[PDB]
Amino acid sequence: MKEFYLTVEQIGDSIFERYIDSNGRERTREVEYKPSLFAHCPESQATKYFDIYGKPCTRKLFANMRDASQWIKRMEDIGLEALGMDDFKLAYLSDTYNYEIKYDHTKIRVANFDIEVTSPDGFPEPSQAKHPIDAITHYDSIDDRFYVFDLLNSPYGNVEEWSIEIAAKLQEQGGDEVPSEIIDKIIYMPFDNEKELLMEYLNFWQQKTPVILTGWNVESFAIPYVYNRIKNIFGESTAKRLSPHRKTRVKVIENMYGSREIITLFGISVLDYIDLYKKFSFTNQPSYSLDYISEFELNVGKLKYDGPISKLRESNHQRYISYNIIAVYRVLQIDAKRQFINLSLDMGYYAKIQIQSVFSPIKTWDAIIFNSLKEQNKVIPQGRSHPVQPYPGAFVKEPIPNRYKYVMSFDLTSLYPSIIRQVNISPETIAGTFKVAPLHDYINAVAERPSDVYSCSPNGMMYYKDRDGVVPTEITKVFNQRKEHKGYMLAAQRNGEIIKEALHNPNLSVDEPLDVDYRFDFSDEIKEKIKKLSAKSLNEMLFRAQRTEVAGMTAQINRKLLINSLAGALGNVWFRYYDLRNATAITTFGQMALQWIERKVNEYLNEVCGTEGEAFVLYGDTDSIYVSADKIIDKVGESKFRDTNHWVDFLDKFARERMEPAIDRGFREMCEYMNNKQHLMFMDREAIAGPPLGSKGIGGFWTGKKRYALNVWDMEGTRYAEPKLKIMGLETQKSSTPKAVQKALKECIRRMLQEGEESLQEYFKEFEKEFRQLNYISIASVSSANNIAKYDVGGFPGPKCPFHIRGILTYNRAIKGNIDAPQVVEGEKVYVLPLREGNPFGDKCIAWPSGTEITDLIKDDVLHWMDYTVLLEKTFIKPLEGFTSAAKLDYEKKASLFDMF
DNA sequence: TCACGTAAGCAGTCCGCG
DNA sequence: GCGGACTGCTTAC
Ligand SMILES: Nc1nc2c(ncn2[C@H]2C[C@H](O)[C@@H](COP(=O)(O)OP(=O)(O)OP(=O)(O)O)O2)c(=O)[nH]1
Ligand SMILES: [Ca+2]
Ligand SMILES: [Ca+2]
Ligand SMILES: [Ca+2]
Ligand SMILES: [Ca+2]
Ligand SMILES: [Ca+2]
Ligand SMILES: [Ca+2]
Ligand SMILES: [Ca+2]
Numbered sequence: 056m057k058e059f060y061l062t063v064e065q066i067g068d069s070i071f072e073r074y075i076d077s078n079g080r081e082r083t084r085e086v087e088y089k090p091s092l093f094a095h096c097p098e099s100q101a102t103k104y105f106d107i108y109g110k111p112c113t114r115k116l117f118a119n120m121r122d123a124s125q126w127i128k129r130m131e132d133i134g135l136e137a138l139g140m141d142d143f144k145l146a147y148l149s150d151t152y153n154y155e156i157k158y159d160h161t162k163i164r165v166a167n168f169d170i171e172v173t174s175p176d177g178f179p180e181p182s183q184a185k186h187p188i189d190a191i192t193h194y195d196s197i198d199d200r201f202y203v204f205d206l207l208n209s210p211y212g213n214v215e216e217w218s219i220e221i222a223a224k225l226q227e228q229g230g231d232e233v234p235s236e237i238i239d240k241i242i243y244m245p246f247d248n249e250k251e252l253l254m255e256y257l258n259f260w261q262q263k264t265p266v267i268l269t270g271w272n273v274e275s276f277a278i279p280y281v282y283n284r285i286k287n288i289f290g291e292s293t294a295k296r297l298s299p300h301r302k303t304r305v306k307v308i309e310n311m312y313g314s315r316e317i318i319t320l321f322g323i324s325v326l327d328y329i330d331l332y333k334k335f336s337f338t339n340q341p342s343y344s345l346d347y348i349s350e351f352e353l354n355v356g357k358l359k360y361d362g363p364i365s366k367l368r369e370s371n372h373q374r375y376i377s378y379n380i381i382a383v384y385r386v387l388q389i390d391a392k393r394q395f396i397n398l399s400l401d402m403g404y405y406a407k408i409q410i411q412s413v414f415s416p417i418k419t420w421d422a423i424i425f426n427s428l429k430e431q432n433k434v435i436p437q438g439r440s441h442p443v444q445p446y447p448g449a450f451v452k453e454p455i456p457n458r459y460k461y462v463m464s465f466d467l468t469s470l471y472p473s474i475i476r477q478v479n480i481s482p483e484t485i486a487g488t489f490k491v492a493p494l495h496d497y498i499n500a501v502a503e504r505p506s507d508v509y510s511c512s513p514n515g516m517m518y519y520k521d522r523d524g525v526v527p528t529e530i531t532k533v534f535n536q537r538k539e540h541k542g543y544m545l546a547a548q549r550n551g552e553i554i555k556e557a558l559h560n561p562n563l564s565v566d567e568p569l570d571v572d573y574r575f576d577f578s579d580e581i582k583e584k585i586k587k588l589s590a591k592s593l594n595e596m597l598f599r600a601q602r603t604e605v606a607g608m609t610a611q612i613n614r615k616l617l618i619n620s621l622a623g624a625l626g627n628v629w630f631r632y633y634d635l636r637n638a639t640a641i642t643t644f645g646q647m648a649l650q651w652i653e654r655k656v657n658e659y660l661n662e663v664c665g666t667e668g669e670a671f672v673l674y675g676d677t678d679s680i681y682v683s684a685d686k687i688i689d690k691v692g693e694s695k696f697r698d699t700n701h702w703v704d705f706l707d708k709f710a711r712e713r714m715e716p717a718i719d720r721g722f723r724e725m726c727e728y729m730n731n732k733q734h735l736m737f738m739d740r741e742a743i744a745g746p747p748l749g750s751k752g753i754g755g756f757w758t759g760k761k762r763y764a765l766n767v768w769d770m771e772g773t774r775y776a777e778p779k780l781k782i783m784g785l786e787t788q789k790s791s792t793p794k795a796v797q798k799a800l801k802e803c804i805r806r807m808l809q810e811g812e813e814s815l816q817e818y819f820k821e822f823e824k825e826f827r828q829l830n831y832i833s834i835a836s837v838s839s840a841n842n843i844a845k846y847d848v849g850g851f852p853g854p855k856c857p858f859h860i861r862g863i864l865t866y867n868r869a870i871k872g873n874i875d876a877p878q879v880v881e882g883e884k885v886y887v888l889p890l891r892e893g894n895p896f897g898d899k900c901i902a903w904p905s906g907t908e909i910t911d912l913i914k915d916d917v918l919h920w921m922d923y924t925v926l927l928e929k930t931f932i933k934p935l936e937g938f939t940s941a942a943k944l945d946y947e948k949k950a951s952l953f954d955m956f
Numbered sequence: 957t958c959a960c961g962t963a964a965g966c967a968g969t970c971c972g973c974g
Numbered sequence: 975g976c977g978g979a980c981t982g983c984t985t986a987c
Contacts, residue, residue, distance in 0.1 A: 414959045416960050625960085677962095788986095857970055961983095963985100
């Protein structure tokens with residue numbers, strides 16, 4: 056096999072590299088890498104190196120990396136550009152791996168670990184590490200084993216050994232229900248004392264040194280705690296054995312509000328699963344506890360125990376250890392579904408970066424572009440200082456708030472990357488500028504044609520047409536990868552709907568799920584067999600189809616994220632290729648494209664309907680248009696359709712055969728107008744929406760920009776077994792909205808769109824009558840909690856104190872004195888409840904850490920003083936009033952002449 | 957919330973609005 | 975009471 060790196064570090068004048076050799080073995084080497092950098096030279100001098108603008112450069116080879124860094128400094132002192140890759144480990148990887156990397160994940164040691172620390176006096180601070188580490192579970196991907204290190208003797212209690220037999224038993228047997236599939240994979244090691252435990256862990260770590268290190272909050276808790284605890288017991292040198300090169304650095308992580316400290320282990324790539332989840336999952340959660348996320352992702356029950364966690368080891372050590380083991384497994388289960396480790400490895404090896412750099416698209420793109428240019432003997436420019444400047448973004452149409460019965464939407468494929476490719480936008484393709492007219496003039500095609508030579512954006516920029524820029528070239532590669540995975544995702548989605556259909560008529564038989572590849576549309580033969588399957592087999596196939604869809608979604612949406620982040624990176628001052636001319640060229644072109652096609656669609660439809668000035672496009676945001684299809688349906692007549700599917704088919708055919716060709720012609724004209732390099736504005740039908748045939752449902756409504764709901768029957772070629780609510784921006788979609796309220800508002804919307812006013816009124820009446828029975832957590836609002844200290848004036852709210860911060864200050868006074876009570880963490884999320892006038896907390900609201908039950912010291916009083924009326928008005932009635940008034944209907948029955956008889 | 961971008965909605969504070 | 979200036983937080987794209 057071809058070799059591939061695992062980790063790379065610069066330490067002084069050496070590169071330290073862990074890699075897999077040509078025989079599949081893990082090796083380590085120290086290399087005295089001599090980097091090269093570049094300077095401009097006279098034209099009359101013979102060279103093969105040129106900068107991206109075509110100016111000749113001389114290569115300077117340095118005795119060592121420090122000499123290269125000091126040369127960069129002197130060049131600044133002189134006032135001359137120092138060209139080339141200044142991150143020497145990226146240059147090393149580029150030199151050492153000058154081919155497309157084919158990696159074997161089975162040779163990469165991926166470690167997933169979790170620790171337990173008993174602490175009576177509050178949260179055990181990693182920087183202090185003053186309490187014993189009393190449990191470690193460490194899963195190794197190569198061994199496929201859970202290594203359990205269990206402390207039996209502590210100043211906080213002496214305990215008996217954990218029993219794997221009781222661990223395996225049902226909770227109804229007094230057991231812990233550790234999943235049977237991992238029982239045989241547990242390697243249990245009890246310890247007489249903490250020093251023994253930690254020494255053995257370090258020996259273990261040395262034998263099985265993680266390459267990728269993950270877990271849940273490992274970077275903020277587990278790693279710095281273990282490091283600092285070993286440091287406290289044994290000294291720094293022993294703690295540094297956590298690094299395969301015995302080098303660590305305290306790293307200060309700074310944000311807008313403050314700073315925290317992590318430990319950097321040289322020679323290890325830490326990918327904390329919480330951070331992977333936050334970047335790559337496209338969720339915003341009310342809580343990021345492992346229990347909360349595990350329930351959301353896997354539908355597993357909350358890990359139940361009695362009393363505080365600080366007393367769990369002493370009261371029930373058996374459960375204590377089992378739950379530590381289960382916590383490690385939960386992360387593995389989440390990754391088996393979401394596949395973020397696979398994604399990170401794919402992206403990291405593609406770009407030739409340290410794997411942990413996948414969090415940074417700026418770093419990722421710097422490496423991709425550097426490697427690409429190096430292939431042509433081209434030389435990258437020096438990164439420069441830039442002041443942060445605002446620049447314009449997308450266009451969003453102001454909709455007329457209303458119900459909209461029949462709606463068909465259309466959307467541009469991968470817009471910003473398609474603009475980059477169409478226009479040929481890149482640092483080195485800038486050809487000059489032209490005199491700009493108002494955007495309106497380009498939109499309406501009355502402005503003078505910008506150029507007869509170059510490819511243009513309506514921000515005034517011109518680009519070369521003779522050759523693709525490096526940015527278009529490299530963005531195209533990742534776009535094409537994304538396209539493949541999106542195809543797999545959509546096929547799995549369509550396949551899932553087939554199974555859902557068949558589930559309406561399951562067979563009474565014993566059988567097995569079919570062995571199929573869900574990434575490809577089911578054949579006729581598979582379809583025939585599916586129709587003969589039991590509900591058990593069908594449900595298993597559905598689960599598998601949905602897992603395939605999720606895997607496809609991870610792969611496609613995050614490649615979309617990477618390419619969109621290149622468009623954004625052009626507007627970030629730390630990007631080597633930062634250029635507001637280019638960032639704005641993209642966004643302004645987008646504004647034109649959307650409003651151009653709005654005009655074209657309105658013109659086309661006014662023509663076919665024989666009208667004038669009628670607004671068929673009701674809304675658009677960035678790259679999408681929403682078209683009123685009422686007049687199209689009315690042209691054949693609702694009574695002419697056999698069922699809902701019949702008019703959906705009709706609108707599908709109309710979009711495909713009439714509208715898409717009209718849209719295409721309109722965009723080809725725009726391409727010619729801007730003289731672009733390549734026509735890539737591909738706008739396809741997205742959603743077909745409307746009420747069920749024969750119903751009183753309203754189909755859809757808009758309340759304003761970025762706030763709408765549609766009853767969708769078909770989305771991007773997926774014909775749903777049951778209609779799907781597409782709700783954007785409304786309170787149902789916000790993590791700040793109480794869980795039970797999201798649910799109730801969603802049902803109000805469902806009834807509005809599918810059933811009509813009377814159904815809505817019936818439901819509202821019931822919710823208002825019963826909502827006081829709902830669990831307090833389900834009706835609590837949620838908010839991030841920043842700058843608590845800023846608004847804290849002697850325990851009370853200062854001027855302009857936000858409502859949720861007021862709640863936290865209330866909480867802090869009510870728990871004051873208690874070291875044991877859960878503390879609200881700065882920057883984390885809280886639940887928030889309003890309190891009735893005259894309550895013992897002395898304020899109008901209270902907040903506590905999200906994902907948790909409020910402490911038993913104040914729970915009874917919170918429940919008693921909860922202001923249900925205010926809660927209902929703010930979270931439910933106010934938003935529903937917004938929905939219904941927009942839709943022109945009433946959530947409460949109006950008085951009529953029929954009342955009373 | 958260390959880690960690409962802008963547009964834009966709503967909650968809530970403060971205070972005006974005769 | 976609403977709304978404007980503002981902070982804060984959260985979505986859509
Ligand atoms: N910089 C940046 N721009 C974004 C992001 N999300 C959306 N945009 C901009 C660029 C997109 O091309 C454009 C339209 O977004 P869409 O959600 O419709 O996705 P896009 O067209 O890229 O992909 P698609 O092929 O429709 O699935 O909006 C983002 O996360 N970062
Ligand atoms: Ca724990
Ligand atoms: Ca799009
Ligand atoms: Ca599409
Ligand atoms: Ca059947
Ligand atoms: Ca879109
Ligand atoms: Ca098309
Ligand atoms: Ca203070």
